[PDB]
């Protein structure tokens with residue numbers, strides 16, 4: 001059976017993910033590598049109208065006190081459902097084609113973001129910004145689809161100053177430095193969480209250490225430097241100080257989903273061609289998988305091209 | 314070989330039963346070979362958010378009165394459904410790893426108050442029919458329906474509409490408002506769901522029959538697929554956008570492997586309880602994945618009941 005290499009480029013927006021991905025894709029033949037782009041058309045028109053603008057405007061109004069936290073939360077929750085829909089459906093239809101982890105792959109699929117971006121990372125950042133409740137975040141977490149074998153996720157590293165500059169120049173988006181800090185923090189925590197879990201970390205065991213980044217490498221992070229630290233919110237705690245079991249189970253799910261992922265860190269603090277080559281080098285250590293059928297490869301290509309054509313900018 | 318497990322999801326339109334019928338189910342779970350996972354009302358009223366049900370019905374009411382727009386309503390309904398389904402989704406996520414392949418007497422029987430599709434498909438679809446939810450949101454929820462594991466036995470209630478109104482009227486939940494339009498919508502959705510499973514099990518291909526919605530198994534017009542001929546999901550030329558077609562492919566995948574059983578609620582609580590037991594003979598059992606799965610599932614089920622009532 002031919003092999004497949006799936007690579008999800010994720011991390012805070014504004015670092016150069018899209019450019020780097022396009023450049024990498026431009027290196028290979030036409031049908032040896034395919035790009036599943038940002039589904040902007042879905043967010044702007046198909047799933048809803050100007051979702052990105054609606055999100056930034058809602059956050060803005062909240063920060064201005066023009067709307068309540070509850071009003072912002074319902075809007076953000078609904079908006080994130082729209083945001084993640086394309087990722088979710090793609091994963092659901094791709095799942096049957098993915099076999100065990102496996103040598104040139106017959107096909108490389110590069111994704112612009114993974115489902116956890118819309119089901120975990122941004123919701124978590126909105127939570128830190130006061131525009132989403134922690135319960136809604138955990139509901140999203142409980143909905144994260146089972147992690148498929150060979151889930152290679154590439155996160156990005158970039159100095160905040162450089163990130164801010166790059167963002168202060170380059171939809172309906174607004175320049176929110178607080179959101180940038182929050183999303184940068186969430187993705188940093190995410191990387192540590194994966195490393196924490198792969199180093200044998202048990203959140204239930206270390207929860208008490210919770211009172212007052214890189215993966216595939218380094219020592220085991222302290223739980224306080226992982227995503228688990230975000231869910232110590234009073235809303236999730238029972239009178240006795242412990243997490244309600246329903247939320248604790250959502251954390252068990254978070255652990256299960258993240259522990260099997262293969263996370264890599266890409267340094268975006270360089271030229272476009274530089275990032276491309278760095279990413280190319282990174283793919284050398286990524287995990288490939290066998291496909292379930294002989295026709296899976298062509299089917300996957302069609303799926304990717306169909307997705308790109310319909311929801312890509 | 315690992316012990317066997319029998320999972321039963323009691324679903325269908327709410328308000329068909331009686332308090333005594335439920336207590337019998339609680340009684341059923343008294344023995345350690347059977348556990349009854351009740352509705353997570355505490356999660357809906359307090360843990361996940363404040364009075365979620367009240368919020369849902371007030372929102373629809375305000376939409377009907379024209380106090381709010383369809384858009385405002387949809388945002389509220391979508392957010393509320395995420396809260397409503399969270400207990401089911403988290404339960405499925407943690408239980409899933411314990412379910413093995415299809416398989417005497419089950420070592421354990423888990424009777425759940427509802428399946429995740431109730432909150433991820435059925436109520437959302439009903440609200441769509443009530444004009445309070447976009448069809449894109451419904452398909453987004455559908456895209457998140459957990460994979461259907463072996464032994465997914467879902468019991469759907471059957472009851473004449475007038476009798477259903479009678480029972481619903483006498484057992485309204487906190488914040489609920491007696492809405493006959495919503496009753497009709499949810500009853501239709503579940504009727505369509507039952508037909509859909511049969512349509513799929515008999516080899517129906519929604520893509521092949523799609524053209525019939527605009528032109529032995531149920532007619533596609535009598536399945537959930539007819540609800541997605543919604544204009545918002547179609548391109549200028551009338552074709553369904555691929556992203557939504559894929560969501561329908563997911564729906565077909567999830568529903569085909571479900572084992573539906575119809576429970577007639579038009580009888581006494583003892584009758585309904587007996588009818589349920591009668592239905593178990595044809596239900597599919599599965600093996601668990603580990604020797605410790607049974608005890609774990611039991612703890613999970615009991616903890617859920619105790620914490621979320």
Ligand SMILES: Cc1c(CC(CO)CO)n(C)c(=O)[nH]c1=O
Pocket residue numbers: 013014038055080083084117118122
């Ligand atoms: C992915 C995502 C984003 C980021 C956006 C690019 O800046 C789309 O990639 N945002 C802002 C959100 O608010 N929610 C989201 O889910």
Ligand SMILES: Cc1c(CC(CO)CO)n(C)c(=O)[nH]c1=O
Pocket residue numbers: 327328352366369394397398427431432433436437486
């Ligand atoms: C599961 C569910 C329900 C029904 C609930 C009773 O109100 C269980 O019997 N409802 C009403 C909703 O409005 N949304 C839902 O998701």
